[PDB]
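User: Hello! My lab partner asked me to get a predicted holo structure for this protein. The small molecule is FLK, SMILES included with the sequence. Please write out the structure tokens.
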Amino acid sequence: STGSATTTPIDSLDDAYITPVQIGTPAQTLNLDFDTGSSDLWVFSSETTASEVDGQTIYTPSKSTTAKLLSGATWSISYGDGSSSSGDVYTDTVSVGGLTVTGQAVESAKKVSSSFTEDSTIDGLLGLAFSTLNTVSPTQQKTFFDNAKASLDSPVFTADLGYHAPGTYNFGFIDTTAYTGSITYTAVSTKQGFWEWTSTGYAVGSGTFKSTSIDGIADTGTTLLYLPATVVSAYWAQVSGAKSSSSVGGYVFPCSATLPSFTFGVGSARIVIPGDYIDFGPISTGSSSCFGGIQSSAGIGINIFGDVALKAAFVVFNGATTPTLGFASK
Ligand SMILES: O=C(CCCl)NNC1=[NH+]CCN1
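Assistant: Hello! Below are the structure tokens for the protein in complex with FLK.
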């Protein structure tokens, strides 16, 4: 089997991407944030504290003839941006783009942090890291991809995120029309539960490529690109007027700037992030200072190849017995 679904930016800055997911019988369609940096599928629901719902579509398990409470199971999660949610758990039928998993753990939120409430476009998250990160207790649950893997034509999914435009998530096949050149595959460590790999280096604009190993994770659920302070300093040094702002919480730059591209190494191959991808717009409405799309990972604890990086590429999340990651230009 295979599945294919369109993923759409939630706003003009590509702050996140939502993908329609069918849950339950008859189908309840929620727009979920596909997140390769976590492993819980959780939804706003009829159980979410009423004051914490503001425009989201909710999952009502009592209206699904296939929903079953998973007795005693609870979940609680915090993400790299400080947001969090928690609740109880049902199993139900979940379909993405024609691909169906019966008995998927659907984690029903009782509480969400303010960041989720304030984002009316995201109805929940669909985690696609490794199931060892799943937060359900006392019985850990499998991701959608994990549950679907055996049935898929090939044990893979691909992320093809658009820059200010719709994109595609495919399960079980590689669309050879969706990228240029060849796919370079690189080894993955599952030891932390993430799609963790090692970039071979970087360049800033037309500069010379620096060979240096950068361990990081491929994370569709993070907006920006978080790299070591040395790398990030080298990038923003090429931008007149750019500075790290403690008050704003990161690198900012004059909105009048044209930004240099940023290249990251995948084995012997190169992915080039266009400069425009690194512009995340005014720090506040009307401001002439703009927030940078490349930020320091210091204090985060891990380097994160977020959407800024992943949307410059066609990305293959290969869940074979020995997982690997594939990157192609597009
Ligand atoms: O939580 C992380 C970072 C793990 Cl190091 N990514 N996934 C995610 N989903 C919502 C915001 N962040």
